[PDB]
Amino acid sequence: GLMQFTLPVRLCKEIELFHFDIGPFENMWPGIFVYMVHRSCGTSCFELEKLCRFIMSVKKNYRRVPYHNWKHAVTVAHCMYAILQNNHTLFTDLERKGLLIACLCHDLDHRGFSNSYLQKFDHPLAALYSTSTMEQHHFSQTVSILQLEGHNIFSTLSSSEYEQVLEIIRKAIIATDLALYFGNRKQLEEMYQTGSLNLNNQSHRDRVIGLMMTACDLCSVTKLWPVTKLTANDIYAEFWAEGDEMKKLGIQPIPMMDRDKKDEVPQGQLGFYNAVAIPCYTTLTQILPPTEPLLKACRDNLSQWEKVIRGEE
Ligand SMILES: COc1cccc2[nH]c3c(=O)[nH]cnc3c12
Ligand SMILES: [Mg+2]
Ligand SMILES: [Zn+2]
Structure with missing residues (x-):
């Protein structure tokens, strides 16, 4: 109980910021994650022997792919940390536990291919x-790892609390499916704007947690330009492999995913920021005002992509 984790002074300060980068040192990522659970949750939330054994099984089960890897998992968990820390009293003891585990686990066993490629394959x-x-x-893999002897970090919860936390985690993970985000944000837009948004309404909470998950999942667009720009190379590395694998199935890929049409990338990112990112963090900021820095950074990076197209870098 008396064992805290601590970080170097630069990290200790930077980690509180939405635009924090977790750095190139793999071996420091679990300590960053545990630091975040303790500060977000309590030193009490989990038994450390169990949490550490969970984290390491979760790491083992992320693959060595260009973007959808262990680093993505920990980056997405940090964004959820930032949101929860700037919205302290809005979330239950349980929700704070659940949402950081859902983020860490949300892309478990990703091979770097869209749902769409699975279906055509x-x-x-x-x-x-x-x-x-x-x-x-991903949610199936989470429950598998939880069911490993010595990895049930929810052991000490009641029977009912346990079922609530796995339902929070199941909904959270499912909501990282971007095909579901469009409808979800539109319904949140209408509810906020007609003024019927009610945080005591469970069905409403689920919608808002789902938006947060999208917000956390896309949080590469909310970093400082040098991080956003270099992550985009990782993201597009996956898109180009997938487009190659579409070509092997006798299907010409959309020009975004095609590694012959790299020229079209900057306009690809405009559309993505304009149709997905800006709308996402706009709505997120209207429901949770203390998340405004994500919107501001996303706007800054949209501007940086405009400059790429205008041949200014
Ligand atoms: C996975 O989400 C992202 C995070 C950052 C930049 C991105 N660009 C695209 C894109 O052009 N299509 C779909 N997704 C993305 C995307
Ligand atoms: Mg995913
Ligand atoms: Zn993800």
Whole structure:
């Protein structure tokens, strides 16, 4: 109980900021995650032997892919940390526990291919779950790791609290399916704007947690330009492999995913910021005002992409 984790002074200060980068040192990421659970949750929330054994099984089960890797998991968990810390009293003891584990686990066993590629490939997972294919797999992998002897970090919860936390985690993970984000944000837009948004309404909470998950998942667009720019190389490395694999299935990929049409990337990112990112953190900022820095950074990076197209870098 008396064992805290601490960070070097630069990290200790930077980590509180939305635009924090977790750095190139893999071996320091679990300590960053544990630091965040303790500060976000309590030193009491989890038994450290169990949490450390969970984290290391979770790491082992992320693959060595260009973007959808262990570093993405820990980056997405840090954004959820930032949101929860700037919105202290809005979330339950349980929700804070659940949402940081859901973020760490949200892309478990990702191979770097869209749901769409699974369906055109006719992958067994597409027969097992017809929509949110990878997302239903990620949640399945989370429950598998939780069921490993010595890895049940929720052991000390009541029977009912346990079922609530796995339902928070199941909804959280499913909501990282971007095909579901469009409808979800539109319904949140209308509810906030007609003024019927009610945080005591569970069905409403779920919608708002889902937006947060999208917000955390896309948080590469909210970093300082040098980090956003270099992450975009990792993101596009996956898109180009997928487009190659579409070509092997006798299907010309959308020009975004095609590694012959790299010229089209900057306009690809405009559309993505204009149709996805800005709307996402706009709505997020209207429901949770203390998340405004994410909107501001996303606008800054949209501006940086405009400058790329205008041949100014
Ligand atoms: C995965 O989300 C992202 C995070 C950052 C930059 C991104 N660009 C695109 C894109 O062009 N299409 C779909 N997703 C993205 C994306
Ligand atoms: Mg995902
Ligand atoms: Zn993700």
